[model samples]
Target chain A: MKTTIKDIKTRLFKIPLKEILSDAKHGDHDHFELITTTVTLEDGSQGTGYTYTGGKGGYSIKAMLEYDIQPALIGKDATQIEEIYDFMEWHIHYVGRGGISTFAMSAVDIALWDLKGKREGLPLWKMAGGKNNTCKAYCGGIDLQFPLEKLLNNICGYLESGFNAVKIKIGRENMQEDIDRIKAVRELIGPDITFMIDANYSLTVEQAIKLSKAVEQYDITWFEEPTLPDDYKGFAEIADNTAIPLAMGENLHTIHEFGYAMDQAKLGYCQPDASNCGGITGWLKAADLITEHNIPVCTNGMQELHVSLVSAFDTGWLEVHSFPIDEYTKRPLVVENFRAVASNEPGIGVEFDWDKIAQYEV
Target chain B: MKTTIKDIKTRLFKIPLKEILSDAKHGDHDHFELITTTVTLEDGSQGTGYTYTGGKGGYSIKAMLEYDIQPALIGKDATQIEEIYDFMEWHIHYVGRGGISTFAMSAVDIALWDLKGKREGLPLWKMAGGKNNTCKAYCGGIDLQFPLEKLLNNICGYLESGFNAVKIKIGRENMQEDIDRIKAVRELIGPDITFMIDANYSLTVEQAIKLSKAVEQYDITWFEEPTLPDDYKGFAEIADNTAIPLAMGENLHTIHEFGYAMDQAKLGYCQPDASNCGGITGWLKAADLITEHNIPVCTNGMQELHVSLVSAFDTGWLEVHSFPIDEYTKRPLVVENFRAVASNEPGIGVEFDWDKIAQYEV
Candidate 1:
């Protein structure tokens, strides 16, 4: 069911989640939860998309979808995705260039394609097929607040789930706690796991150097964002001072922003998040740059949906932060053929049950 | 005559205004009168201090003063300002570590100091004990859309106004306009006026090179932010490719951000905004590193208030982006202290007639 002009009438619904994953803040008191939505087309096929990480963007995504983007695309063709994105961007360009608006547009764009792919009965990867569908899978555990016991339990959970790689959050107030946490996690996970430490650009360059040096023996897969999002000069300093491969990119919002990181040859791994990566369109462009650098991408979040996007290029590993549908998701959020059995289905190669989806009413 | 802490409490007001001056996108519509704010505090004795500017920071500053700061200093002594600043920062440390807060704080600090100095019947320079009172001011008639007639008029005015240095805004959508404009202004301003071009981090590496090559004939003073702000590598590339001195630092915010630019030795001129350049405390620290590279600083905006901070260090030149303050306030906004006759008054010497300022009700 490749949709034509007559197919989908874009619909927007605002959905609020029960509790922002309480542990989301990495121990800050500020509470936040995912403000996500589903945009269903006239074809009865739909897509589920959320912002990369909802902070100021939680309200923005919903507002854009409700007031600006969905209205513009109501009678437009869902099949013409590139044109759809262009149309959305052209109209909502004033809303914001590549921040929350791009993220929301991306979610809508991906969802429209997902619906179209499901209609055609193909996995997302197969529809946009070029490379191999089966990419390597890794574990990126999202447990920054995990106590020593909870941390091991979370890591072990991923290990048991057959994920060989994992990325953890750092940049705690106490440097010693951070080091000990990493050391303990590494000890429990063993050397085989692709253990990556992401300080999330919260550490100062000095702190980054100090921490990276202390844990250099543990063998971090790569140190991600050791400084603020805008610190290119600091990144250079970090690169020169430390041996740990400095990985960054998720904060890059525009071609200009990316140019800063890539042009400087500052980044070791380009971690582009789907929602914030200027959606698929921007990421595809970035993939070429990464390819040019001969650097493999250890991707950021929204893995299930982004796996198809990541698979389009030479991605090093797929991040499985947490798998096996939890209490949060409805109707068993299944990972259809990940890594060992990656899908060849068209347009992100995943299906969301509309009936079950309607019950949630996002 | 040095006022006690009780005397400083009476004069605090906050007003938000959008500072729409000019824009490149919609010709005349690309207005710059975007939202800016002003905070004024006086001691009922000397000068009324004002600090405020564009962005969504006006309210935050007001709240910081009203809720936390001003209240704490109700009965304290304002003459002991260093101790006051330390107390405010240490106590209300989370008010915000960057941007307008520091500027707001400076306004208060400067105002208090101004009161003390004025009470002592001394000019601010004398208060600080007469260092370099003469500031070499630069002309910033930089506009993306340099309506030639306006451009010529601006150049002629700056030339007439005794400004020996000038800079133009480049990296317009029409690169040719940028090239033509830069050349035109250099010719109009004559050889006596030093000319510079700021790309505002708008160019691609290719664009930067192309534009730089095109304008190289005019003997541009220095290129400012020729590429994206975060691209240290690209900055290095531009710095290496062009003989023109590279100028940056305004886009960067904190002392932490300054380290990279300093290390790269990317610029002949380090132009950090006094507003965004982390208050006097931070700038004093950053100035040390910037001076290490022998990169002379051409300070960015809020010149009136910033002069005191710049006076604290031996900066190379003072950049005045907006000249001849044509607003509601009387007199040239930048307190032309060094213009033949220095103000005998202290702090940011100019006295804003309160009746003129009363229109902007907080």
Candidate 2:
């Protein structure tokens, strides 16, 4: 039975949660968190996706879905997922090919994929390609609120909790303070732990170079968003200027933008976000290009669903955003044997706990 | 009188006049367009910023103004133009900042400046500090729609119209086609005419290099957006790899993005849009850095209002998007005084004819 692509819908629901994790981040206007709308079909199949935009631009996402994207999907063969996805993009051509518009489209596209997989009784990773299942997971526990001692305690807490790989937030303080923290974290965690730093566009190109150089002794795996996202030349400068593996993307919206980074070899790690960077469709295409460049695909954000995206692309690791799920997601999305630890369940292998959602929605 | 910052009202009205210009042989998107919006304000004064977005996305110019921007402007001090403008941006910090949103802001900002200028009883260009009210006008004419014969005729048209310099569109086709057009346009326009070409991001890095190298024989003033907007590395490659003076920044959204481009020195010309790049306020900051980088500020498209902005920043030339007013505009916005063009009127130096605007609005 040939199923035609039919309609796109945007569902916006408000959920009330006091604190997401340890009373640190509560779901408020400041946090701007959102649950993604799912794309559905007559066959009860759906595409799974969510807004990574937090609360910001969520309304734009809703508009893009109801008007620009859904019409494009109607009456098309839904089985041909990629084809339908491209058509939706063409309809929204003028608004801009990326950003909020695309973010909305990505949610629907991913939701549609989930629907298709659930209908076919296969998980999304399996439908795309058999998942590598488990990839390595790292604990990223550093917050601006934590003192160095508390941050150290947090890192040690994660180490005890079974995450050997860890990423520390840097660029909040000066190079000396950053170095002190890294040194302390390293000395305490020792050589067995993997260390990473993300600047979040806080550093100047000069500062990034200086810090990257200084942090080499600590065996830092990657330095991320060092300069602004548009600074491909600065990225290349830092890449060529320092020995550190500069990690970039996330703020980058499309593969076309990522392709420029790849062509320049600007970043050693190409972190493609499934939700942020044109959803699963565009992310996979970007992965093909990244693979050719031989740059390791560090799955950026969306830690829950991204386990499968990383597996489909044969990526090395999924960069989990928070440590141990917090209160947002109870268990890691995927669970498996050997290679790492993840689920082979269909689609993202995880679904939002409707009961938890209902409690907040009510 | 100390004018305290108070309420700022931002409103948008859509216009139906497609601006039937006399340039095109066969009407295209720009030739015979449909709807255009008149971005206006309350004090019976206005700024006419048109959105070129084709059908649907075009509507966003309206939506963003009424819902996104106008709400931000109401009840802010109209005198502290910069601070109030910043507050508008700060209000929309979560919503998408670039494209239509900025376009909406551009209309209001231009209107505010116009009001401010009228209050001071000074012309915009003078307030902006143009050395002379006259900016050297370029003979920009169409090439793709016009053949070799019509192309030559178009050049004659600009030359006869009293333009000293000229720029032609290229990269609609392959390398050889662009080369032939360049040569043909140059031969027709003659060597005395300062010639430039805008490829509009229609070339690959290799293609940009190949085309620029082949045509370096012609004294093409600058090659514009030869590669994509995000392709800084590609643009840099073309910059280092070719003899053509590389220029870009029309698609750039913020000063930070432009600064990222400056890090590569590839974009020798910074084209800040008075409307799209957060109005005169944002572009003024950009022009400061652009001047510091020793690059000329190339104003993009909206020469009508930018005449003041360029003057404020003391840009190289008031980039006239279209020279010699078409019948659509009630009176000549960019006027000529033998040696120089533009009037010494206050604010944007020209007013929108209300009778003409009533045709397009609600």
Candidate 3:
């Protein structure tokens, strides 16, 4: 009855997006690479977790897991989640303190968490001390490709899908264009709805301040990643200069990096994506850190999985991502009245349509 | 003739280390991966630059270069170094803002700089505005496995190789053991020769402070990576509590990350490796940032290429690494009386023996 990890395997898939999406940082992506890591326990209990890349470097993530990380995890007690995470973190620390190692570690850590939930026959949200069954959600669109008309139409689509809150992409060559887009979205969504803007770390401190001031009347819930995420000092300058609350965390891959952001960046929202920020375990640590600072917590992406983590937390927002990674899942994310409800099923409650996904597997 | 890059190719090699090395964080590695990138101009001029990985993730680096990066470089104006660097930076920024992306970008950026130097018929030192033809050099050993006798012997080897300054590995589980190693090395090297210790980001703030205080009597040059590299607050605390000048940056893959470290971490030395810190372009930016702050700059590894950069900079340390990646090259790094002399040959003058490296290609 020892639940030992017997094997770990990763499957890589290249799934095309509904349309080419553009962001300030990432020019465009017609497709993204989905990396699914499956960890099997001795008792025949299997758990699956996945991460995605911007259509490239998927091979390296797969290679790291298969050639280095996975082989080291074999025969370890599946229940020793923290120990395994530490071992793996240190194992690849020299070559990959972040990036592929963190992404790879996130996949494995998430799978192990799933295994734990399955073993106990309890949903991850409940097991992690379910605070709320539903979390406030927002629709985040990677709409740099969308013309102003298409952009407005996209926000309307979110509204039709039962989302009241929305976040739009910014970072146009002209600040006036960005301002015009923000104004249009605000007028369309109305003052009653929550609206936010993300520049994807595209602006300088001066530009961010200027934009924040120009859109102050729009009631922006937060200015997300207006400048480089790692430049905490620059972030602090933006926070100090603008009335708009600065939100970030998605770009950071480790809890320690998040700690730096929290301590120095004056971040209004703590948005850690579990997929890249060291999985659920790392996300939880980040949540705890943010709570101590009395800042509201939110997630960057992976809304299907983030639903549970957000539900388990006291304060946070779950973004119903535009990517729709959940469309490939058996239980697609259900959003009602700007809230994403968590699944009561065991583990992360995400069941990938393997048959369909297999077709796209590289 | 317009110096347009016609093609870019990478050769991967797995080179064995002389001995196993250990630190507080990374356990041990007996071999490392070397990736050599050769950029050919349309006029038949070629320049070579290389990067190293800590045994793992080389395949992914190679894959990133071959599959994504190399193809994108075709038909680019090689003389427009900064423009090409920016293009590649944003192009790969989404999938790889840091980590493998930076490492992959470093190889290409370095090669492009090499090509630029070749085209101008000037040594990189002169092309970069040579402040000095030589740089203060130190020997950095990855010698956690070496006992006291062997460790002493290793320092003797460095001294024999003309290194007056030395950095040793620390972060033993027992702080006393780390103290003993430092004391022994300090006594052996004497006060005239500079001594430094690197924990490799393996200590708690409390532990880092305690060790810093313990080693104060030894006149340690600087405590390197005493805590998690990402924790700027923790690093700041260590800086506030300890007089030891904290040095870090190798683990940081981006210029912005270095900006955070410099602003908040109270870093005494800014050590960015060109291979990972966005190449020569990124390194130069970091150097400028640190210079503005009146802080000294240093490099982590790749002494052969770094010699030129270090020579160009007003202040910095060039570490003749234990890895000795240049030993297999045509012109090994020349050290005279603890100073690393840059090659006067056009480009970053270190050419690998393809025959030797080809045998290790996977």
**Best model per DockQ:** 3
Model 3: how far is B89 from its true place, Å?
Answer: 2.5
How well is each residue in B296-360 modelled by candidate 1, as lDDT tens digits? 75577656544554554555677775622224344343435333223445544555555754645
Each model's TM-score for chain A is 0.82, 0.88, 0.98
Q: Write the per-residue lDDT of candidate 3 for residues B147-226, one digit (tens) a residue.
A: 89999998998888778999999988888999998999988988898888898988999999999999889998899999
lDDT of 1 by residue, A222-289 (tens): 88878776677688888888888888776665555566677664777777666655566556666666
The weakest ten consecutive residues by lDDT in model 1 chain B span B26-35
Q: Residue A210 of candidate 2: its Cα lDDT?
A: 89
Tens-place lDDT per residue, model 3, A307-330, is: 999888858888887677899999
- Docking verdict class for candidate 1: incorrect
lDDT of model 2 at position A243: 89
Residue by residue across A196-247, what tens digits does model 2's lDDT show?
A: 8877666788988888888899898888778766667778888888987888
Fnat of each candidate = 0.00, 0.13, 0.55
* Chain B, candidate 3: TM-score: 0.97
- Assess every candidate by TM-score: 0.66, 0.74, 0.95
Order of candidate numbers by DockQ, starting with the best: 3, 2, 1
lDDT of 2 at B315: 49
Off by over 4 Å in 3: none
TM-score of 3: 0.95
